[PDB]
């Protein structure tokens, strides 16, 4: 049998993601910008 006679204290790093960026989208702004006609067409298209 092999028996250890000495020891070491090791310190190892474990990197763990916890959160990601919280984001929100102004659907009308992205799809239509500042166009009024596009905004009306988007309303007619349906609110997804």
């Amino acid at each position: 049998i092999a028996i250890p006679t000495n020891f070491s204290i090791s310190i190892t790093t474990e990197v763990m993601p916890v959160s990601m960026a919280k984001t929100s989208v102004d659907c009308n702004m992205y799809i239509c910008g500042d166009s009024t006609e596009c905004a009306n067409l988007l309303l007619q298209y349906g609110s997804f």
Binding site: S19, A21, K22, T23, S24, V25, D26, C27, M29, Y30
Partner: protein, 96 residues
């Protein structure tokens, strides 16, 4: 460190240096974006298109305070503060 202004620990300072977080802070005024049009900043471009990033509820200082409290608790009390009321114990005996 009680003396330094960071309020976080040294290792935490190094770790926050390692990662490049792009833009600092979550506030970008309309005047700022309009005054620096020549630099095609990505954040201005995505904010002008309706995409916004919301700040985390807990600030980095608050998270650092949580981490400092955890480290101090494990140093002074040890494992006993995870079950009931934190019980003080010398660090050498906790190691034993």
């Amino acid at each position: 460190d009680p003396l330094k202004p960071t309020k976080r620990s040294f290792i935490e300072d190094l770790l926050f240096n390692k990662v490049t977080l792009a833009d600092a802070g979550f506030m970008k005024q309309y005047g700022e974006c309009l005054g620096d049009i020549n630099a095609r900043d990505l954040i201005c471009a995505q904010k002008f298109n309706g995409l916004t990033v919301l700040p985390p509820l807990l600030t980095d200082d608050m998270i650092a305070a949580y981490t400092a409290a955890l480290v101090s608790g494990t140093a002074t009390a040890g494992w006993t503060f995870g079950a009931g009321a934190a019980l003080q114990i010398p660090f050498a005996m906790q190691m034993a």
